[PDB]
Amino acid sequence: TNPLQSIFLTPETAKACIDAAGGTPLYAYSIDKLEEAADACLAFPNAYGLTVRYAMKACPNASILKYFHSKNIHVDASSGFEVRRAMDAGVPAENISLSTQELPEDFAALVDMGVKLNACSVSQLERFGEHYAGKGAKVGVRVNPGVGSGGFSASTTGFSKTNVGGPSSSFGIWHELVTDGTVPDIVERYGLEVERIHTHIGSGSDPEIWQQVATKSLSFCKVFPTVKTMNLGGGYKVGRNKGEVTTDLQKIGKPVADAFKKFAEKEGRELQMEIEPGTYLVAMAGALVSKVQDKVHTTGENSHTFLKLDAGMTDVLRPSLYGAVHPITILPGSGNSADVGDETESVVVVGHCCESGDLMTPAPGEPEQLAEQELRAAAVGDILVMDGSGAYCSGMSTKNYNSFPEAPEVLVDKAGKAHLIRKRQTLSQIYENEISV
Amino acid sequence: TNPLQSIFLTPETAKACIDAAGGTPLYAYSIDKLEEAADACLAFPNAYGLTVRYAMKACPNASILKYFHSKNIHVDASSGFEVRRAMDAGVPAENISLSTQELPEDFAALVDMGVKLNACSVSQLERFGEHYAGKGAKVGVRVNPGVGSGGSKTNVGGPSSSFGIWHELVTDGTVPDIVERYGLEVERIHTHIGSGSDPEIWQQVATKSLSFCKVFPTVKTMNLGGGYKVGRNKGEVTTDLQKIGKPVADAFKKFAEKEGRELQMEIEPGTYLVAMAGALVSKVQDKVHTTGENSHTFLKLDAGMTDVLRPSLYGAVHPITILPGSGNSADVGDETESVVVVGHCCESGDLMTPAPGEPEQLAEQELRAAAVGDILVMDGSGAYCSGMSTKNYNSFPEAPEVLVDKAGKAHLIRKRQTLSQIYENEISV
Numbered sequence A: 001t002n003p004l005q006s007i008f009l010t011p012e013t014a015k016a017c018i019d020a021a022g023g024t025p026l027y028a029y030s031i032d033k034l035e036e037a038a039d040a041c042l043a044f045p046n047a048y049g050l051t052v053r054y055a056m057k058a059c060p061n062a063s064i065l066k067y068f069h070s071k072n073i074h075v076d077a078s079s080g081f082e083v084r085r086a087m088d089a090g091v092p093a094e095n096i097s098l099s100t101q102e103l104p105e106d107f108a109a110l111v112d113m114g115v116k117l118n119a120c121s122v123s124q125l126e127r128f129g130e131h132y133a134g135k136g137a138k139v140g141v142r143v144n145p146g147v148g149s150g151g152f153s154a155s156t157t158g159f160s161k162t163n164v165g166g167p168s169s170s171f172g173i174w175h176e177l178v179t180d181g182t183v184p185d186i187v188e189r190y191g192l193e194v195e196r197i198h199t200h201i202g203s204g205s206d207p208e209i210w211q212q213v214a215t216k217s218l219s220f221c222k223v224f225p226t227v228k229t230m231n232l233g234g235g236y237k238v239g240r241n242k243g244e245v246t247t248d249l250q251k252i253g254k255p256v257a258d259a260f261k262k263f264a265e266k267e268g269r270e271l272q273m274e275i276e277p278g279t280y281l282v283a284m285a286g287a288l289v290s291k292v293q294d295k296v297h298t299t300g301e302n303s304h305t306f307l308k309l310d311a312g313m314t315d316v317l318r319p320s321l322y323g324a325v326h327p328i329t330i331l332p333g334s335g336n337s338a339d340v341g342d343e344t345e346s347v348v349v350v351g352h353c354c355e356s357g358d359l360m361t362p363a364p365g366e367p368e369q370l371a372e373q374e375l376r377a378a379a380v381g382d383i384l385v386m387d388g389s390g391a392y393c394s395g396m397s398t399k400n401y402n403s404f405p406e407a408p409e410v411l412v413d414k415a416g417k418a419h420l421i422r423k424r425q426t427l428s429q430i431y432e433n434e435i436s437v
Numbered sequence B: 001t002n003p004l005q006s007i008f009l010t011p012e013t014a015k016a017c018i019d020a021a022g023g024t025p026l027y028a029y030s031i032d033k034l035e036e037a038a039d040a041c042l043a044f045p046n047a048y049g050l051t052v053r054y055a056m057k058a059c060p061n062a063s064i065l066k067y068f069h070s071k072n073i074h075v076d077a078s079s080g081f082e083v084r085r086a087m088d089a090g091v092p093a094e095n096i097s098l099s100t101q102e103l104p105e106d107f108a109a110l111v112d113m114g115v116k117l118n119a120c121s122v123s124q125l126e127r128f129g130e131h132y133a134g135k136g137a138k139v140g141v142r143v144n145p146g147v148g149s150g151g152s153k154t155n156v157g158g159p160s161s162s163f164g165i166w167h168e169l170v171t172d173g174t175v176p177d178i179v180e181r182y183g184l185e186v187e188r189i190h191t192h193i194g195s196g197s198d199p200e201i202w203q204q205v206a207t208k209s210l211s212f213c214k215v216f217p218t219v220k221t222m223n224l225g226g227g228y229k230v231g232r233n234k235g236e237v238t239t240d241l242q243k244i245g246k247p248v249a250d251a252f253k254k255f256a257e258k259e260g261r262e263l264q265m266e267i268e269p270g271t272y273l274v275a276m277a278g279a280l281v282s283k284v285q286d287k288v289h290t291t292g293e294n295s296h297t298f299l300k301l302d303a304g305m306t307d308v309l310r311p312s313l314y315g316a317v318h319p320i321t322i323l324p325g326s327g328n329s330a331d332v333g334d335e336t337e338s339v340v341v342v343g344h345c346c347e348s349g350d351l352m353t354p355a356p357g358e359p360e361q362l363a364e365q366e367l368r369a370a371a372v373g374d375i376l377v378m379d380g381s382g383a384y385c386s387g388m389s390t391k392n393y394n395s396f397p398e399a400p401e402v403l404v405d406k407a408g409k410a411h412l413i414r415k416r417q418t419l420s421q422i423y424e425n426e427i428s429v
């Protein structure tokens, strides 16, 4: 019952990556897994047109940007730095939209090159309008619809928890500022033209929740008759572990596309749709590849067997940050599929950082508790593969903690060959900006 | 009224760091606060000697290292990379202790230079013994005493921890026979299970840790590790080094009387040395509102989890103060406002004012009324912030670090990273 491969790495393909990266740890990305997600998103049900934007904050490697560009997938940038980064990878400016918490001081330069801006607060709209007064520049507007992920918590707001929308969220402009005239007054003051509305409150895999997401956001498109595009954001869930449900884009897409048809039947306007998936595009396409460098034991009550890797929260932080479980497969350090065998052992996986919280197998949703996974019996030198690590891992980790170098990145082509796309960082590069004093 | 200053920055001094750094965000370190912490640690009560090691994993800046080195403070490194990094800052090899989860493949090269190694596993002790078999080597042993912080959760000791060698492998001959099979000389013992502020607990920590130096008569040093608690927020208790050290020093006296050996003591403060000595200096670049049930006023900083992760990672509260953006203390005023503070990352969890221990729940702080452009200073951020953050998330460059001397002058110790450097190691095709 031992897995003969991981989500996309056989024992032969894993050693091929390690050789290309000069050792462990490393990030492995599979072109095959990127093509499945790209095609699945480009097949999203739409009524009058679809645009897929990659939320590059999930994984900003230029090869990933170049690949999604070749598939006619656009880019959703989270800051002026991501805008300038995507343009370095060859993405044209017009294919980038900027939705940020911090409007960069050089936003006007980006807008001039063709970058579409989604104003995310009153302050950003006014700064945009001050610079392009009476012209009247087109701009996007992100709205906080007044509700977030969960509805009204099946009762009243309840506890004020973090959310992508609602009264406990700082994202977007509060919906009451749209309906009380505050935002339309700013638009008229600077002669702006609102061409696009942006929302981001979708979650789960319920088609009837996504239809309500669309209906509510579309109601803001009738406030500004010049709007021609509706950006519904991301949030499509990916089930990394067995039993968890991945969102079916065809099942939730058709009620969304019908909500677009109902708008065109009640308003007479056929709107372009946009989606901003981050996790759904790159999550299962990436995997952390590390080696078991040590194996220790405790005895007595609450004792465990610990597998210590040469990686950790420096490379995958989601276990420590959320208590997220990742699929884990242990392959023979020989690289031969004949040495997989059929021996299992329940273990706890820990990271190489000298920190108690550097745990790789936590209890679901509780990063302070231990949990054991039944894996292949591992000797020192065997490869551990953490799958589903292509989103918010390389692009969001505590790199250089304990002064560990930033892990390299490898691309595995459709033929099973490994290509290095980011060389390992050197030690001196970690403190190359320090100044003597 | 409102605070006319932060823990160590006035509006004028804060503007000085911003000038020296080119803008916000930035880390600021106080030479004064480092000096105050260095003296308290160097005054730890001891019976027969004390060595203070800075756990550089909390802030590895070379100026911080050079400073502690000038104060006779040694280094506790947690990886082969930190050992070399500390050596690049001018720290001798002999002033470095290596206690790491991951033994580097070039560890023999570090040991020959003078670096002292504490084996944290049977595997490590065996790899050390195989390379130095019968050559008169000396080594330390890090022992899991069998109890963590309780004198199933993640702990620094006990059956739940992977640090380090399980005590039952020492008391059943296994570790003794490894040392004897390779001709090793166990030089010191290493534990790290102390916590809190109770001197009775610290005395139980020292006694149980000293019971393992009985197994190896060659032991001359006893490293009790770190974990000295720092209360960043007003009302929280900071460990009194003087009152917990008197019962610990008595344990060394009781060991010398009954066992006949006067052991040297070592401590590894990390948080205690640098936490209060550093602050995150940022700018309020936006301010938004909501209405209705559980509505809030939000301050959007130009920093976030990319710079200070402890709020999101632990739900840890940090002391916060707001200064006028003009930099003139005459502009502090008397106006206040309860606000939620959020970072600049497009992330629902980039909260900077969470509930204590619940990083997903919002909890407002009463601060000075903030206009866009004002300065927010987050104190208690010199430990596990610049040395432990999600930098380059949303491609934000690594923030600069500034040192503030005794005369109030700001000195740049790390320039702001450029966008190009964030992906200077990427290869095409």
Ligand SMILES: NCCCC[C@@H](N)C(=O)O
Residues within 6 Å of the ligand: A237, A238, A239, A279, A324, B348
């Ligand atoms: N804010 C991040 C939340 C991650 C949720 C996780 N279950 C996923 O599917 O990606």
